[PDB]
Design a protein around this ligand. Sequence first.
Ligand SMILES: O[C@@H]1[C@@H](O)[C@H](O[C@@H]2CO[C@@H](O[C@@H]3CO[C@@H](O[C@@H]4CO[C@@H](O[C@@H]5CO[C@@H](O[C@@H]6CO[C@@H](O[C@@H]7CO[C@@H](O)[C@H](O)[C@H]7O)[C@H](O)[C@H]6O)[C@H](O)[C@H]5O)[C@H](O)[C@H]4O)[C@H](O)[C@H]3O)[C@H](O)[C@H]2O)OC[C@H]1O
Ligand SMILES: O=S(=O)(O)CCN1CCN(CCS(=O)(=O)O)CC1
Length: 339
Amino acid sequence: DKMPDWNIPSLYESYKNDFRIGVAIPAKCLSNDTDRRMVLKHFNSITAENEMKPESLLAGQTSTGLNYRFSTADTFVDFANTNNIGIRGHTLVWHSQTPDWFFKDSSGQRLTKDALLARLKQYIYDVVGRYKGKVYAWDVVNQAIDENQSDGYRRSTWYEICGPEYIEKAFIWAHEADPNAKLFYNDYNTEISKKRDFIYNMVKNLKSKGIPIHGIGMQCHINVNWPSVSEIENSIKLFSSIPGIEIHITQLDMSLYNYGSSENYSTPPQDLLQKQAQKYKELFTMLKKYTNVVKCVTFWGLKDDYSWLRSFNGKNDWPLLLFEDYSAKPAYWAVIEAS
Ligand SMILES: O[C@@H]1[C@@H](O)[C@H](O[C@@H]2CO[C@@H](O[C@@H]3CO[C@@H](O[C@@H]4CO[C@@H](O[C@@H]5CO[C@@H](O[C@@H]6CO[C@@H](O[C@@H]7CO[C@@H](O)[C@H](O)[C@H]7O)[C@H](O)[C@H]6O)[C@H](O)[C@H]5O)[C@H](O)[C@H]4O)[C@H](O)[C@H]3O)[C@H](O)[C@H]2O)OC[C@H]1O
Ligand SMILES: O=S(=O)(O)CCN1CCN(CCS(=O)(=O)O)CC1
């Protein structure tokens, strides 16, 4: 049965002078009394796990433009605002979780570059405009870099139609729609050096020519074995060298498995839970040295059975700070210790 402990130290309170501590949650958590109380106990930022992505906000199109469905997303923003916490908007532009009809006209034909850029402006103006003043940070563009490409750009439909200018224009238009939102470029695998370098140069070049980008989001979807905390620190050191860029750790989780491993556990091995705890302690000890630039650290889920990694890899995993029964893990105590 459920074993939440309402009296153990609050995560965000323990880091209140360092950075916000956030959590990604799906809509079901907003209507579950235990989930809601746990979110508000420990976190001073939330991200909608899926409900603010393009496929969630888009309802359809006609020959005059886009139709939207905002009711569920409104609940997330209202929940954050009424409870005096931040909400990170995730995410305006992404090759995933956007319907393919978004790249087509009302007769099924692929949009031209000019027509797609006009649609991008409409989408950003409508979505960012609706939530103007209420969303402190947006992931404006998610995962636009692919280090396997010689020029570093992911060959998504966005890129195939627009070339790389869709990225800078997304930031320009989001900043017009809400000039006080902090605008982030968000990505994973920042500890692959070639990818780090593409991300660094892209953001630095945008910034140096006056594009309104304010931050880099390091997703930090990691595991107990890789990458090292030192390599995460190397990413922070390089990205923080760009003037006017802050850093959010946006989607932190730590699988118990090596990547591509066929290990599959029914219950979490204690040795791996301890390795996880040690690494989370090391990670937060390092992040605390960089509070001049790291302003928010969000975990990609509330508790282990809610983790996207279970569906992603088709097996049980224990990547977060709370067990399935809401009780604290070794990792939780390690994060408190590091504070
Ligand atoms: O049915 C749907 C349902 O699908 C949907 O589900 C939601 C989907 O969105 C979820 O939210 C998103 C999750 O995170 C971001 O997107 C993903 C980020 O992760 C990408 O995958 C990453 C791939 O790289 C892995 O790292 C590897 C580690 O190993 C490295 O190699 C080392 C090298 O050194 C050696 O020594 C080591 O042995 C060796 O292992 C590799 O180089 C490196 O690649 C990462 O671990 C892994 O994370 C993934 O492709 C992205 O998609 C998004 O931003 C975020 O939105 C959401 O949570 C789900 O709920 O929900 C609705 C249903 O209707
Ligand atoms: O000790 S370690 O070697 O691990 C990292 C030391 N390093 C020195 C510079 N600061 C920022 C100074 S400031 O932004 O507050 O002025 C971040 C961390």
